[PDB]
Each structure stands twice: as structure tokens, then as C-alpha cells.
Amino acid sequence: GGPLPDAKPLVEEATAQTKALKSAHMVLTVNGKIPGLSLKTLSGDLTTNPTAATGNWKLTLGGSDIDADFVVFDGILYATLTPNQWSDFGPAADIYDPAQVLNPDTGLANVLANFADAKAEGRDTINGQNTIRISGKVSAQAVNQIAPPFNATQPVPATVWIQETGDHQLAQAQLDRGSGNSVQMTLSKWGEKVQVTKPPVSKLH
């Protein structure tokens, strides 16, 4: 689709836009295995100030695939243990505060601000939009801050895809823990209004 643009202006533009992000739809995927992570995939909508989230996930615990819906509302994590039966699992922060992903100081914006050696590698269509695929290395600090289970000890090879046009939002990011084991996040619907209310709980609360 033509010559590739320089990576550096796009990374810088995406950093600034990401820093400003209040909300987005996200799809998270774990490839292979990352110690300390049972998550296989998760899809949902996140908003911040105040923090609210809603979606579904697929986990592996023991040798079982487990699907669930989840809500984070007013600091509390709720999930369905059986279809459409909502349970209260206490402070979301005790597991992972979803706002961490979009924290302007320590979230995805910081990942981009600490993304070194950026090089445009190619062009991919993601969710109907041209994006530039860019290789780089993210500092171990930034990785561990956004994803503590990852447990990086040196720069983490990474790929980001940034909208070639428009606001140059971050479309997708992947952090490579080695030999095909990776964590990926795909972002869309930047700035969408998100609808989350406290899930229905029995009177016996």
C-alpha cells in the first residue's frame, strides 16, 4: 500500500493520544503460557475517572477452560460463576485494577513512552483501518508496571500497530515473552461511552 512512514512521529503521536484516553473497547489474548497468568482471552469495555469495566473472559484453571462474564463497578469485581448468576469478589484491585491499562502515567501511554528502537515493519488492516506495524523494545519497568505477572528482567521485544491516519490511536500492542509466548491487546472504540451498573445481587447479598 505504498512506502512506510517513519515510525518515530507515529509512536510519539500515539503516546499523546493514548495518554488522553478515557475509555476504549479492548480484546486481550495470551499466546502460549505466561507464568502467573491463567487468562487466555478477555473482551470488554473500560472507562476511567471513574473506573468501570464490563466484559467476558476465558481462563484455564487446572485442566479446565472456564468462561465468565465480569463487571468492575465502584471498585468491586463481580463475575458469573454460573450463567447469569452474579457473585461479588471484593475489591477489583486485589486481583487487577482495570484502570491500570489506561493510567496516563503507568498504563499503555507509558509503554509507548518507553518503546525504544521503533522501526516500521509493515502495514496491517485491523478492524477496518490501516495501521503501521512497528517493532521495538519496551523497558522491563514499564512492562512490569502494566502487567506484573509478566516478570521481565530485561527489555521486552514488542510490536505496536498505530493508525496510519487520523488521530493515530494505538490499535494493538504485543509483548513477547519468548518463542511465541506473548500477551496482546487490541483497542477500538476510543472514547466510547461505557455502560456499567452494579450487577443484580440476591437480597441475601
Side-chain angles (χ1 to χ4, degrees):
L4 299 171
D6 183 21
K8 291 210 169 73
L10 285 174
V11 172
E12 299 184 7
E13 286 149 358
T15 303
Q17 292 287 340
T18 299
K19 186 172 177 179
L21 268 182
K22 174 184 182 58
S23 63
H25 190 263
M26 303 169 332
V27 175
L28 288 58
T29 309
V30 177
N31 270 254
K33 295 155 79 177
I34 303 184
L37 198 49
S38 286
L39 184 64
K40 297 210 117 137
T41 191
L42 179 161
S43 290
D45 299 285
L46 173 66
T47 191
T48 54
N49 286 327
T51 298
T54 182
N56 52 68
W57 65 48
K58 177 188 295 301
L59 282 21
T60 50
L61 299 164
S64 307
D65 275 337
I66 301 180
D67 289 1
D69 293 334
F70 73 91
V71 161
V72 172
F73 182 79
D74 194 9
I76 303 299
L77 168 67
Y78 304 84
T80 56
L81 291 59
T82 53
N84 298 121
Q85 301 302 154
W86 289 92
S87 298
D88 180 330
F89 293 94
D94 288 345
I95 307 204
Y96 183 91
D97 182 6
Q100 176 67 238
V101 178
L102 294 182
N103 186 293
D105 296 341
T106 54
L108 286 168
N110 188 60
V111 174
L112 290 169
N114 286 284
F115 181 83
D117 301 325
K119 177 183 177 181
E121 300 284 359
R123 188 179 275 107
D124 296 300
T125 293
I126 296 178
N127 293 329
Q129 308 178 321
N130 292 133
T131 65
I132 303 306
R133 188 178 72 256
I134 299 170
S135 57
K137 306 166 188 77
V138 179
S139 72
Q141 291 68 28
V143 173
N144 294 331
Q145 177 66 50
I146 205 178
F150 200 97
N151 199 36
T153 43
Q154 74 186 61
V156 177
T159 304
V160 302
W161 288 256
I162 291 164
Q163 293 180 324
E164 178 163 29
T165 66
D167 289 335
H168 308 296
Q169 296 284 8
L170 178 67
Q172 186 166 279
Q174 187 175 289
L175 300 178
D176 186 5
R177 204 172 190 269
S179 67
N181 309 87
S182 63
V183 76
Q184 182 187 94
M185 174 176 289
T186 306
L187 290 89
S188 58
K189 308 187 70 176
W190 305 266
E192 65 171 350
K193 309 157 98 179
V194 179
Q195 309 294 298
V196 189
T197 54
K198 182 182 281 184
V201 290
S202 68
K203 300 276 192 63
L204 190 53
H205 51 263

